[PDB]
Amino acid sequence: MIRAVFFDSLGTLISVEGAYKVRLKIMEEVLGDYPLNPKTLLDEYEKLAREAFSNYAGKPYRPMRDILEEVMRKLAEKYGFKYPENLREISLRMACRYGELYPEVVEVLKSLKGKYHVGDILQRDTEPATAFLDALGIKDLFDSITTSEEAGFFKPHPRIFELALKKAGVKGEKAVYVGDNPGSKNLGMTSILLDRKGEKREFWDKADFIVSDLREVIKIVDELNG
Numbered sequence: 001m002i003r004a005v006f007f008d009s010l011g012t013l014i015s016v017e018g019a020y021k022v023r024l025k026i027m028e029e030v031l032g033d034y035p036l037n038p039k040t041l042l043d044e045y046e047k048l049a050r051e052a053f054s055n056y057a058g059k060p061y062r063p064m065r066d067i068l069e070e071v072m073r074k075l076a077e078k079y080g081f082k083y084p085e086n087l088r089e090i091s092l093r094m095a096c097r098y099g100e101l102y103p104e105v106v107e108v109l110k111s112l113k114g115k116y117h118v119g120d121i122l123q124r125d126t127e128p129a130t131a132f133l134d135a136l137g138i139k140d141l142f143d144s145i146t147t148s149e150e151a152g153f154f155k156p157h158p159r160i161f162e163l164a165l166k167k168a169g170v171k172g173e174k175a176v177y178v179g180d181n182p183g184s185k186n187l188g189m190t191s192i193l194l195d196r197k198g199e200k201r202e203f204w205d206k207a208d209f210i211v212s213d214l215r216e217v218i219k220i221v222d223e224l225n226g
Contacts, residue, residue, distance in 0.1 A: 002190070002221045004117040004168040004175035009105075010124050010132060012180040012194050013214070018100030025094045030072070034081040045075060056154050063149070064125050065091075092128050096135035102196075108214040109141040116221065117168040119144040121177070123155055144168060156183030165189075176224075178217055182206040190224070192217060 007013060027038040027045065048071045056062065065088045076083040084090065112118045119142060122129050126147045133139040144167040151160035161184055165172055172187035180194045182203045193200065193207035194214065204210050209220050 001225045002116070002174060002176055003170050004119060004165070005112050005217065005221060006119040006121050006164055006168075006175060006177045006189075007109075008122065008177075008179045009120045009138065010122055010129060012178065013101055013105045015100045015102050018098060021100075022095050022098045025098055026091050029090050029094065030084045030087070031081060034079075036079050036081065041075060041079070044078075045071060048074060053154070058157050059154055061148050061152050061154060064123070065128065088128065092131060095128075095132050099132060099136055101136055101138070102214065104214050106138065106141070108217060109138060111218055112221075113141060113143065117143045117170070119146065119164050119168055121146050121160060121164050123148045123160075125149050158183050158187060161187055161189065176217070176221060178211075178214070192220060 023042055023046070024038060027041045031038055031041060049068060052067050052071055056067065068091075069087055072087055073083055109118055120133070122145065124132075124147060126145075126149045129147055130139060130145060133142075133145065139145070144164060146160060146164040146167060148154050148160050151157070151163045153159045161172070161177070165175060165187065168175065172189040176190040176192055177184060178192045178194055180200075182191070182193065184191060190209070191207045192209045192211055193204065194212070195201075195204070195210055196212045198212065211217060211220070
């Protein structure tokens with residue numbers, strides 16, 4: 001049976017409007033009056049971050065705030081503005097201020113929490129990640145929160161999943177993982193791909209289920225439990 005349902009909250013439960021506005025506000029704060037378009041800085045930042053994280057995929061963990069600060073240092077040198085001090089504070093303030101959940105998130109977590117172990121699996125440093133979840137009002141809706149910093153490795157390393165399962169006290173066969181990107185297979189978890197806009201059809205085959213609204217998750221799991 002299914003006894004645990006895991007999510008990737010800061011990555012699949014944050015509205016894209018909200019995620020973009022947070023990142024734009026960060027860029028705007030960094031630049032101040034410097035004569036560079038913040039949307040151009042943002043696009044270039046997302047480029048270098050994606051690249052830097054892929055270099056680390058599956059590797060031993062290194063603080064993500066440190067990696068992002070190197071990226072911003074490259075951008076400051078590239079465009080000529082002064083490297084912002086305390087960038088991690090700027091980012092955490094802007095996320096707590098403007099971060100936003102998809103509309104059905106709270107209802108879905110509250111409904112699962114009575115009958116299942118509800119967990120979060122996150123690739124974000126633990127301290128800022130947990131402060132963000134508190135600001136969003138969902139930290140205490142989770143039975144467990146597990147990060148790559150706790151596990152010691154970046155995805156797709158299985159270790160983060162092994163630890164999340166240990167916290168829930170079950171083997172992979174008893175759990176589902178809801179993510180928006182397709183490591184996790186050898187452990188036996190049931191994968192649900194969240195594809196709100198039907199934009200990742202080429203990756204549907206590598207997922208056991210595909211949804212566009214999180215309210216479909218309770219149905220899949222209630223179904224799987226006879």
